[PDB]
């Protein structure tokens, strides 16, 4: 097992409480970060089974996070809420290990939905 470690990157607090408790009900560890760069730093000492990134503008709209993820982590599955402009970095993400991208829907329902299916498909 995996113990099931889910890491999320978004505004924290609000996004943390919603995804933490809900994901906690699933039986996994849900931790959140400031935006994307944070997980990168924390990842230097740990690797979650599933990673969720908010995409809103960090450095490269949001896909920038993926780039850093592949540099430090090898194939850490990432889940982005939106793919706005620069889908290019999104594709490379899947190569490095990204789970996928969310078109329009999101919220916890679709987010947690896409996050759980990620850990499940991995298992194994």
From Swiss-Prot:
It comes from Salmonella typhimurium (strain LT2 / SGSC1412 / ATCC 700720). GO terms for molecular function: ATP binding; ATP hydrolysis activity; cis-regulatory region sequence-specific DNA binding; DNA-binding transcription activator activity; phosphorelay response regulator activity. Residues 5-119 form the Response regulatory domain. The modification 4-aspartylphosphate is found at residue 54. Keywords: Activator, ATP-binding, Cytoplasm, DNA-binding, Nitrogen fixation, Nucleotide-binding, Phosphoprotein, Repressor, Transcription, Transcription regulation, Two-component regulatory system. One of its GO terms (cellular component) is cytoplasm. It is found in: Cytoplasm. This is DNA-binding transcriptional regulator NtrC. It comes from the Bacteria. Phosphorylated and dephosphorylated by NtrB. GO terms for biological process: nitrogen fixation; positive regulation of DNA-templated transcription; regulation of nitrogen utilization. Its main location: cytoplasm. Member of the two-component regulatory system NtrB/NtrC, which controls expression of the nitrogen-regulated (ntr) genes in response to nitrogen limitation. Phosphorylated NtrC binds directly to DNA and stimulates the formation of open promoter-sigma54-RNA polymerase complexes.
């Amino acid at each position: 097992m995996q113990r099931g470690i889910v890491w999320v990157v978004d505004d924290d607090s609000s996004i943390r409480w919603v995804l933490e408790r809900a994901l906690a009900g699933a039986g996994l560890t849900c931790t959140t970060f400031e935006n994307g760069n944070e997980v990168l730093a924390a990842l230097a000492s740990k690797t979650p089974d599933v990673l969720l990134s908010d995409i809103r503008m960090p450095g490269m709209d949001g896909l920038a996070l993926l780039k850093q993820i592949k540099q430090r982590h090898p194939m850490l599955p990432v889940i982005i809420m939106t793919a706005h402009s620069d889908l290019d970095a999104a594709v490379s993400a899947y190569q490095q290990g990204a789970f996928d991208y969310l078109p329009k829907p999101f919220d916890i329902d679709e987010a947690v939905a896409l996050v759980e299916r990620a850990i499940s498909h991995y298992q194994e």
